Symmetry: none
Subunit: 314 residues, 4 copies
């Protein structure tokens, strides 16, 4: 029945795509108490436009809203414009800032459009980067946790070469990833998670038979984490520990380790959470669907599920 | 409750887009009796794929299906491929042929993707063209009737320049449009419709103060239609006769005459019917939404409304 | 307060409902508002109307200029050449007062075509009458319909589609927009968002459905933007109207503009725009059958006053 | 040294001369002074301006907050809805920074009314904009002109004389004085000697030339003295200005205040919009689109505005 148990910022994404409309449909389906926990970031004009089209004007009065990504002309649904690109980023930036300040506890971004953003002259390569930039952090102090099919997997490294990732790995980097992911687990409604750390090398180096990295990196880090009072197994061969399927959070050393399981088991319904400082940002997992914008064919299921995920009860 | 009272062919459109998905969601909402009146044309594989995503396997057994637009390799949701273009057209072609043969009474096409069809090497300019080709007809024996907000408007011309349209207009062309649209009215559940013919010129030439075209074209055509026993008023200024809102079918000379009223009053309740021989094909009036395809977020409302429209006695 | 500039009100056919509705509309305004509206017509018709409606004391507070004086008593309902001449004389004096700058716009109460024709006067609409009075070509006067929030100016009107197409030029489109933009200021939208309709369906769709748009509407839009106007198009009229997000639409052809307006509004106001003069009709007939029983509705007049009287 | 407090500088229309004069003014200050002025506007406009004015070295040590970001490159001299939005976004961020206490006053560089109108934003002056932003009634925000030693706050502005007279109340005069007295502190006159103008000639001369003064200015003066303020009047505006012994005059009507200021300072007046704790001043010249890009605009009026709002005590 009730899926929102905390304060959330909802950025409406590209004001020309389906974001505004699915934002309205999602809020519609919530109770009044739930609506008052969701603060919406975007141009009012886009939500007004969307509301006209969907015949949901009565909903706009009950909306907590902060203007962001104001446009200089009316909304043109379905058009890829530099303006809507700037809007998108301005909206997500204001949502993120509200999370950073403590006004909300997590962020959801509705679908952007990469081309719209590029044509505005703005570099954008994903939510992990955007979040890093906005919070004044290096991109490797923001981590991606994939969630799907009961698996939660945080990545100690991400979009770089295997060699570069290996060169970056340190006991402290693993610890930062776990800390950030454990906090995120609390949000997702698992206060005391059972954690498994993947091995850098096959079979977690098998002692030191298949490299020194694990004895230098994952083994010390696990020890420090146990000492701080966490329930951590490993390191263990990723293949082996995932198979057991008895942990609430897995810690993957490399992109592929985490991404393969998630995409294989949850190919149509996974959430990608960017975690940095106190900020948890998730997307909706789908594009802006320009050709159906304002055409009343998009439903809010994926958004609602994302809300359910970040909005779970302690 | 129930909206399907006749036999319908449902072509699932681009097997990579949202067509399969919305096909399943629409059929879900119907009773078993209603499901058995909709025969589905498309690759089984795409419906299987869609069923996985929506968790609606239980529905596939109760589905009247004819394989069409088979794919030789798996469904890849969200990709624009020549293969999915050919599939689209093959499915719609099989649905159309089923209507032509009398196996069904009308066709609904789920959303195509123009680029997918173009990349297959197939010329495509709309359902009117496709229907013409398939039924062995010239393009100006197939007419577009828009439906929404109580308005039904058939177009004597469509998708050409005003000049070109005027050069084409003849008493006979107007007659063919009305005939086709009158038959279609029976399908839509209005046996004996009251017809209003738009004037070519403002105020239907206004006693020929504003051109001779109406006296050459619309006036003779109206006469012939009355003589054949039809209830036809006009020609009349389109602006004037639409305002009265007391006709079951309007006959527009030019695209804009028909399209403006429909889209102004119903910008997302518009059905576009291609009418040729005994075949009525309606689209769903939205794209294939590649960005959400296989993401389980697609609404079947527009399809359901199309079904309600073609489905009444 | 609905009257925020000076208006000339021509009472139209002195035998129809015009005088009567002129009085009833002024009645409903404050005294301040009454003094902004100067009335053009035969005093005798206003006196007649006032007697019937029992509104004599309102005639004293009226700014009036005699025009279209009658030679005999008022005969309500009756079509006479005299009432035809009166009509035209009244509207001519209202127009001239606008042209001179004495008022800021004109409202004409309902005429009667037959009355005017029987007087020997050629008359084909307010566009014509305005053109002839101001010494202009009839193709420099444009009609803008206003109703249900829609404002639509017509680049052509009241000729065959073929004839209209033969006339259309980049310059003619530009004149229509200019005239309509100025008019928008009066209506209380100084800097409007403009949509230009395509000549051909889908505005020719590049050049796939004719060359007209690439030759006519496309250059004209590119002059208008350059001069600093907020103009979208050309676009398929059907598409752009549907969105209902522009303050002024520019129609190439009568039907394009007239269908939307008449479908959404049972009334509409029709503004004839020429030079600096905006003349609006009251959008209904002279209603000869109900003239002078003191039962006539001034609502349409009041709405026309509200429209042309709007705040900057 | 002319900057003795923290100031927000909104760079106005990013397409006009605002960014350019912003740079030239900051150039003329010491480094210490520069660090007291926080600049609000699109970085891209400042980058453009820096190229033109050959002041790249100034950009790195500049206190800047991005505001009114553009979605496309800067086009000097062009009136665009985008630059209109930028203007207002920048001024809104400067105002918000003053409201929060981050700065002590705001200077707005020249806007362009047409650019703002074309963006769909209602704009009738800085008084309006400030009212909207601060969640205040538009008639709780007052304009004070400053020039040639005259400071004059206006109880009304920018409406018909009749309309102004209909609005005047004891309370409105009181609000004007209060707002202006606070502003006086900023300008470096903590405890000013105030003169209230009469509505009517000779302040009505008792009641001989109208009742308004006895009903409006006389009670208001009484209440202000009672609250502990040093206030003379009401007196004929012509008479009290002549005495030239007050630190602040209170005008009932636009022309009462505007005539003296513009006669004595026809080129060098500052217009301060005063609302809540926010003081916003314009630069009192336009955006000069004709010369934007050409690096030939004088920053004197800006520097003078800075000197005024940046004053010592
Ligand atoms: O590889 C991906 O699918 C991917 C996409 C987006 C993102 O933030 C992180 C990812 O690993
Ligand atoms: O009328 C003016 O001179 C004027 C100009 C700018 C401003 O902000 C306020 C004003 O009264
Ligand atoms: Cl037409
Ligand atoms: Zn990746
Ligand atoms: Zn079309
Ligand atoms: Zn007409
Ligand atoms: Zn002024």
């Amino acid at each position: 029945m009730t899926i929102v148990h905390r304060r959330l910022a909802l950025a409406i994404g590209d004001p020309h795509g389906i974001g505004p409309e699915i934002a309205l449909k999602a809020l519609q389906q919530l109770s009044a108490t739930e609506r008052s926990l969701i603060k919406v970031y975007g141009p009012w004009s886009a939500l007004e436009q969307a509301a006209q089209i969907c015949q949901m004007e009565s909903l706009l009065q009950d909306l907590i809203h902060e203007e962001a990504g104001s446009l200089a002309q009316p909304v043109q649904c379905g058009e890829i414009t530099p303006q809507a690109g700037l809007s998108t980023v301005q909206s997500a930036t204001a949502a993120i800032r509200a999370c950073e300040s403590g006004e909300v506890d997590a962020v959801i971004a509705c679908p952007h459009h990469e081309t719209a953003i590029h044509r505005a002259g703005i570099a954008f390569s994903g939510y992990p980067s955007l979040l890093a930039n906005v919070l004044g952090m290096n991109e490797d102090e923001v981590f991606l946790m994939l969630v799907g099919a009961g698996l939660r997997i945080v990545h100690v490294t991400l979009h770089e070469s295997v060699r570069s990732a290996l060169e970056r790995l340190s006991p402290q980097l693993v610890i930062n990833a776990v800390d950030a992911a454990v906090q995120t687990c609390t949000l997702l409604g698992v206060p005391k998670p059972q954690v498994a750390v993947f091995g850098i090398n096959p079979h977690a180096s098998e002692g030191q038979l298949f490299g020194l990295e694990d004895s230098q990196i994952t083994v010390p880090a696990v020890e420090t984490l146990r000492k701080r009072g966490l329930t951590v197994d490993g390191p263990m061969g990723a293949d082996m520990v995932l198979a057991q399927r008895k942990h609430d959070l897995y810690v993957a050393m490399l992109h592929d380790q985490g991404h393969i399981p998630i995409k294989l088991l949850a190919p149509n319904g996974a959430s990608a959470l960017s975690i940095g400082g106190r900020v948890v940002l998730s997307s909706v997992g789908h594009g802006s669907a320009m050709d159906i914008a304002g055409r009343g064919v998009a439903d809010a299921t994926a958004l609602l599920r994302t809300i359910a995920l970040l909005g779970a009860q302690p």
